[PDB]
Amino acid sequence: RFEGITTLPNITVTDYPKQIFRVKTTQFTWTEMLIMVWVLGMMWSECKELWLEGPREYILQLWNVLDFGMLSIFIAAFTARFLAFLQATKAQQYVDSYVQESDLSEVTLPPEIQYFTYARDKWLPSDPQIISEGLYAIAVVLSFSRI
Amino acid sequence: AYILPANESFGPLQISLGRTVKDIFKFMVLFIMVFFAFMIGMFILYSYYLGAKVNAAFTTVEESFKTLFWSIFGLSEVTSVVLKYDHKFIENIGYVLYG
Ligand SMILES: CC(C)CCC[C@@H](C)[C@H]1CC[C@H]2[C@@H]3CC=C4C[C@@H](OC(=O)CCC(=O)O)CC[C@]4(C)[C@H]3CC[C@]12C
Q1: CA count, 13 A, side-chain hemisphere, A2
Q2: Are A125 and B60 in contact (CB < 8 Å)?
Q3: A30 touching B, CB under 8 A?
Q4: Rounded CA gap, A117 and A28, in Å?
Q5: A144·B47 Cβ contact <8 A
Q6: Inter-residue contact A5 to B52 (CB < 8 Å)
Q7: Using CA atoms, how far apart are residues A36 and B73, in angstroms rounded to an integer?
Q8: d(CA B3, CA A135)
Q9: Is any Cβ of chain A less than 8 angstroms from the Cβ of B38?
Protein backbone atom coordinates (compact mmCIF):
# COMPACT_ATOMS: atom_id res chain seq x y z
CA ARG A 1 0.00 0.00 0.00
CA PHE A 2 3.06 2.29 -0.17
CA GLU A 3 1.84 3.60 -3.54
CA GLY A 4 -1.85 3.47 -2.62
CA ILE A 5 -4.59 0.86 -2.41
CA THR A 6 -5.34 -0.88 -5.70
CA THR A 7 -9.12 -1.30 -5.51
CA LEU A 8 -11.59 1.41 -4.57
CA PRO A 9 -13.37 1.08 -1.19
CA ASN A 10 -16.63 0.47 -3.09
CA ILE A 11 -15.44 -2.74 -4.79
CA THR A 12 -15.29 -6.15 -3.10
CA VAL A 13 -12.70 -8.66 -4.33
CA THR A 14 -12.52 -12.26 -3.08
CA ASP A 15 -10.27 -15.20 -3.91
CA TYR A 16 -12.96 -17.86 -4.26
CA PRO A 17 -16.68 -17.09 -4.70
CA LYS A 18 -17.98 -19.04 -1.69
CA GLN A 19 -16.02 -16.95 0.83
CA ILE A 20 -17.27 -13.90 2.70
CA PHE A 21 -15.43 -10.65 1.97
CA ARG A 22 -14.94 -9.93 5.68
CA VAL A 23 -13.02 -13.19 6.08
CA LYS A 24 -10.70 -11.91 3.34
CA THR A 25 -10.44 -8.50 5.01
CA THR A 26 -9.89 -9.53 8.64
CA GLN A 27 -7.66 -12.60 8.32
CA PHE A 28 -4.30 -12.51 10.09
CA THR A 29 -1.28 -12.31 7.82
CA TRP A 30 2.02 -13.84 8.94
CA THR A 31 3.78 -10.58 9.83
CA GLU A 32 0.70 -9.59 11.85
CA MET A 33 0.88 -12.81 13.88
CA LEU A 34 4.58 -12.13 14.40
CA ILE A 35 3.65 -8.69 15.76
CA MET A 36 0.99 -10.37 17.92
CA VAL A 37 3.28 -12.90 19.61
CA TRP A 38 5.80 -10.06 19.91
CA VAL A 39 3.31 -7.94 21.85
CA LEU A 40 2.47 -10.95 24.01
CA GLY A 41 6.15 -11.40 24.88
CA MET A 42 6.64 -7.72 25.66
CA MET A 43 3.52 -7.77 27.83
CA TRP A 44 4.82 -10.85 29.67
CA SER A 45 8.09 -9.05 30.42
CA GLU A 46 6.30 -5.89 31.56
CA CYS A 47 3.89 -7.84 33.78
CA LYS A 48 6.83 -9.74 35.28
CA GLU A 49 8.53 -6.47 36.19
CA LEU A 50 5.20 -5.17 37.52
CA TRP A 51 4.79 -8.23 39.75
CA LEU A 52 8.38 -7.85 40.97
CA GLU A 53 8.44 -4.11 41.70
CA GLY A 54 4.80 -3.88 42.78
CA PRO A 55 2.09 -1.64 41.32
CA ARG A 56 2.81 1.33 43.62
CA GLU A 57 6.46 1.65 42.59
CA TYR A 58 5.63 0.54 39.03
CA ILE A 59 3.21 3.41 38.38
CA LEU A 60 5.58 6.11 39.71
CA GLN A 61 7.73 6.21 36.56
CA LEU A 62 5.58 7.89 33.91
CA TRP A 63 7.48 6.32 31.01
CA ASN A 64 6.67 2.85 32.33
CA VAL A 65 3.01 3.90 32.34
CA LEU A 66 3.39 5.00 28.72
CA ASP A 67 4.91 1.63 27.79
CA PHE A 68 2.15 -0.30 29.58
CA GLY A 69 -0.50 1.76 27.79
CA MET A 70 1.12 1.20 24.39
CA LEU A 71 1.21 -2.57 24.91
CA SER A 72 -2.40 -2.65 26.11
CA ILE A 73 -3.47 -0.60 23.07
CA PHE A 74 -1.79 -3.04 20.67
CA ILE A 75 -3.65 -5.83 22.48
CA ALA A 76 -6.95 -3.94 22.18
CA ALA A 77 -6.49 -3.35 18.45
CA PHE A 78 -5.81 -7.04 17.83
CA THR A 79 -8.77 -8.06 20.03
CA ALA A 80 -11.16 -5.85 18.05
CA ARG A 81 -9.71 -7.27 14.82
CA PHE A 82 -10.28 -10.81 16.13
CA LEU A 83 -13.89 -10.06 17.08
CA ALA A 84 -14.48 -8.68 13.59
CA PHE A 85 -12.90 -11.85 12.19
CA LEU A 86 -15.04 -14.08 14.42
CA GLN A 87 -18.20 -12.43 13.11
CA ALA A 88 -16.68 -12.76 9.62
CA THR A 89 -15.95 -16.48 9.90
CA LYS A 90 -19.37 -17.12 11.50
CA ALA A 91 -21.17 -15.36 8.65
CA GLN A 92 -18.89 -17.32 6.32
CA GLN A 93 -19.87 -20.58 8.02
CA TYR A 94 -23.55 -19.64 7.66
CA VAL A 95 -23.15 -18.79 3.97
CA ASP A 96 -21.16 -21.93 3.15
CA SER A 97 -23.49 -24.14 5.20
CA TYR A 98 -27.02 -23.07 4.32
CA VAL A 99 -27.01 -21.44 0.87
CA GLN A 100 -25.85 -23.03 -2.38
CA GLU A 101 -24.94 -21.09 -5.53
CA SER A 102 -22.04 -20.21 -7.80
CA ASP A 103 -21.58 -16.54 -6.87
CA LEU A 104 -22.70 -14.89 -3.64
CA SER A 105 -23.68 -11.60 -5.30
CA GLU A 106 -26.70 -13.10 -7.06
CA VAL A 107 -28.02 -14.58 -3.80
CA THR A 108 -30.22 -12.71 -1.34
CA LEU A 109 -29.25 -13.42 2.27
CA PRO A 110 -30.74 -12.73 5.71
CA PRO A 111 -29.99 -9.07 6.46
CA GLU A 112 -28.07 -9.56 9.71
CA ILE A 113 -25.84 -12.02 7.82
CA GLN A 114 -25.85 -10.16 4.47
CA TYR A 115 -24.34 -7.08 6.16
CA PHE A 116 -20.94 -8.82 6.08
CA THR A 117 -20.89 -8.66 2.27
CA TYR A 118 -20.84 -4.85 2.19
CA ALA A 119 -17.82 -2.85 1.07
CA ARG A 120 -15.78 -0.30 3.03
CA ASP A 121 -18.19 2.61 2.57
CA LYS A 122 -21.31 0.79 3.80
CA TRP A 123 -19.56 -0.32 7.01
CA LEU A 124 -21.21 0.63 10.29
CA PRO A 125 -19.32 3.45 12.06
CA SER A 126 -18.71 1.16 15.08
CA ASP A 127 -17.33 -1.90 13.29
CA PRO A 128 -14.64 -3.61 15.42
CA GLN A 129 -12.17 -3.51 12.52
CA ILE A 130 -12.43 0.29 12.37
CA ILE A 131 -11.54 0.43 16.07
CA SER A 132 -8.72 -2.01 15.31
CA GLU A 133 -7.30 0.23 12.57
CA GLY A 134 -7.49 3.38 14.69
CA LEU A 135 -5.93 1.80 17.77
CA TYR A 136 -3.25 0.18 15.60
CA ALA A 137 -2.29 3.54 14.08
CA ILE A 138 -2.09 5.09 17.55
CA ALA A 139 -0.04 2.12 18.76
CA VAL A 140 2.44 2.46 15.88
CA VAL A 141 2.85 6.19 16.55
CA LEU A 142 3.49 5.43 20.23
CA SER A 143 5.78 2.45 19.58
CA PHE A 144 8.07 4.63 17.49
CA SER A 145 8.76 6.58 20.72
CA ARG A 146 10.78 3.75 22.32
CA ILE A 147 13.97 5.26 20.84
CA ALA B 1 31.14 31.66 1.89
CA TYR B 2 34.65 31.63 0.41
CA ILE B 3 34.54 35.43 0.13
CA LEU B 4 32.59 36.75 3.14
CA PRO B 5 35.15 36.04 5.94
CA ALA B 6 37.47 38.70 4.50
CA ASN B 7 34.94 41.38 5.49
CA GLU B 8 35.21 42.46 9.11
CA SER B 9 31.48 43.21 9.01
CA PHE B 10 30.33 39.85 7.61
CA GLY B 11 32.96 37.42 8.90
CA PRO B 12 31.67 36.90 12.45
CA LEU B 13 28.14 36.51 11.07
CA GLN B 14 29.17 33.65 8.78
CA ILE B 15 31.15 32.03 11.60
CA SER B 16 28.07 32.03 13.84
CA LEU B 17 26.12 30.62 10.88
CA GLY B 18 28.44 27.64 10.54
CA ARG B 19 28.22 27.17 14.31
CA THR B 20 24.43 27.17 14.56
CA VAL B 21 24.12 24.85 11.53
CA LYS B 22 26.54 22.35 13.09
CA ASP B 23 24.48 22.54 16.28
CA ILE B 24 20.95 22.20 14.89
CA PHE B 25 21.89 19.23 12.69
CA LYS B 26 21.33 17.04 15.78
CA PHE B 27 17.83 18.37 16.47
CA MET B 28 17.14 17.88 12.76
CA VAL B 29 18.04 14.20 13.21
CA LEU B 30 15.71 13.88 16.20
CA PHE B 31 12.93 15.68 14.32
CA ILE B 32 13.46 13.27 11.41
CA MET B 33 12.88 10.41 13.85
CA VAL B 34 9.65 11.81 15.32
CA PHE B 35 8.39 12.95 11.90
CA PHE B 36 8.95 9.48 10.42
CA ALA B 37 7.06 8.07 13.41
CA PHE B 38 4.00 10.23 12.82
CA MET B 39 4.19 9.80 9.03
CA ILE B 40 4.10 6.01 9.17
CA GLY B 41 1.35 6.13 11.78
CA MET B 42 -1.00 8.38 9.83
CA PHE B 43 -0.19 6.59 6.57
CA ILE B 44 -1.19 3.23 8.05
CA LEU B 45 -4.28 4.93 9.47
CA TYR B 46 -5.62 6.57 6.31
CA SER B 47 -4.22 4.43 3.47
CA TYR B 48 -7.51 2.59 2.88
CA TYR B 49 -9.48 5.77 2.07
CA LEU B 50 -7.93 6.53 -1.30
CA GLY B 51 -11.14 7.84 -2.86
CA ALA B 52 -13.05 8.67 0.32
CA LYS B 53 -11.25 11.85 1.45
CA VAL B 54 -11.42 15.56 0.68
CA ASN B 55 -7.94 15.49 -0.87
CA ALA B 56 -5.30 12.79 -1.31
CA ALA B 57 -3.10 13.97 1.56
CA PHE B 58 -2.49 10.83 3.66
CA THR B 59 -3.35 8.19 1.04
CA THR B 60 0.19 7.23 -0.01
CA VAL B 61 3.63 7.37 1.59
CA GLU B 62 5.03 10.21 -0.50
CA GLU B 63 1.88 12.34 -0.23
CA SER B 64 1.71 11.76 3.53
CA PHE B 65 5.35 12.90 3.71
CA LYS B 66 4.52 16.01 1.66
CA THR B 67 1.49 16.91 3.79
CA LEU B 68 3.20 16.36 7.15
CA PHE B 69 6.35 18.21 6.07
CA TRP B 70 4.44 21.21 4.75
CA SER B 71 2.53 21.21 8.04
CA ILE B 72 5.77 22.37 9.69
CA PHE B 73 5.45 25.81 8.08
CA GLY B 74 1.65 25.95 8.45
CA LEU B 75 1.26 25.62 4.68
CA SER B 76 -1.04 22.57 4.98
CA GLU B 77 -4.76 22.92 5.57
CA VAL B 78 -6.63 21.06 8.29
CA THR B 79 -9.28 19.78 5.87
CA SER B 80 -6.82 17.07 4.79
CA VAL B 81 -7.86 15.00 7.83
CA VAL B 82 -11.61 15.03 7.11
CA LEU B 83 -13.24 11.93 5.62
CA LYS B 84 -16.18 11.72 3.22
CA TYR B 85 -17.85 8.80 5.02
CA ASP B 86 -19.36 8.67 8.52
CA HIS B 87 -16.40 6.91 10.18
CA LYS B 88 -16.24 9.46 12.98
CA PHE B 89 -13.76 7.44 15.05
CA ILE B 90 -11.07 7.40 12.35
CA GLU B 91 -11.30 11.12 11.62
CA ASN B 92 -11.29 11.94 15.34
CA ILE B 93 -8.11 9.89 15.75
CA GLY B 94 -6.74 11.78 12.75
CA TYR B 95 -7.50 15.12 14.40
CA VAL B 96 -5.86 13.95 17.63
CA LEU B 97 -2.73 12.59 15.94
CA TYR B 98 -2.23 15.65 13.71
CA GLY B 99 -2.66 18.04 16.64
C1 LIG C 1 25.75 44.75 -5.38
C2 LIG C 1 25.90 43.68 -6.46
C3 LIG C 1 25.78 44.28 -7.85
C4 LIG C 1 27.22 42.94 -6.30
C5 LIG C 1 27.26 42.17 -4.99
C6 LIG C 1 28.55 41.36 -4.91
C7 LIG C 1 28.69 40.62 -3.58
C8 LIG C 1 27.61 39.55 -3.45
C9 LIG C 1 30.08 40.02 -3.42
C10 LIG C 1 30.84 40.04 -4.75
C11 LIG C 1 32.16 40.77 -4.52
C12 LIG C 1 32.35 40.60 -3.02
C13 LIG C 1 33.37 41.49 -2.32
C14 LIG C 1 34.73 41.43 -3.00
C15 LIG C 1 35.82 41.97 -2.10
C16 LIG C 1 35.66 42.19 -0.78
C17 LIG C 1 36.78 42.83 0.02
C18 LIG C 1 37.05 41.98 1.26
O19 LIG C 1 38.05 42.54 2.13
C20 LIG C 1 37.75 43.76 2.88
O21 LIG C 1 36.81 43.86 3.65
C22 LIG C 1 38.71 44.91 2.77
C23 LIG C 1 39.88 44.65 3.71
C24 LIG C 1 40.64 43.43 3.24
O25 LIG C 1 40.42 42.91 2.03
O26 LIG C 1 41.48 42.91 3.96
C27 LIG C 1 35.76 41.73 2.03
C28 LIG C 1 34.72 41.03 1.18
C29 LIG C 1 34.39 41.84 -0.06
C30 LIG C 1 33.68 43.14 0.31
C31 LIG C 1 33.47 40.96 -0.90
C32 LIG C 1 32.11 40.82 -0.20
C33 LIG C 1 31.04 40.11 -1.03
C34 LIG C 1 30.97 40.73 -2.41
C35 LIG C 1 30.57 42.20 -2.27
Answers
A1: 0
A2: no
A3: no
A4: 19
A5: no
A6: no
A7: 38
A8: 55
A9: yes
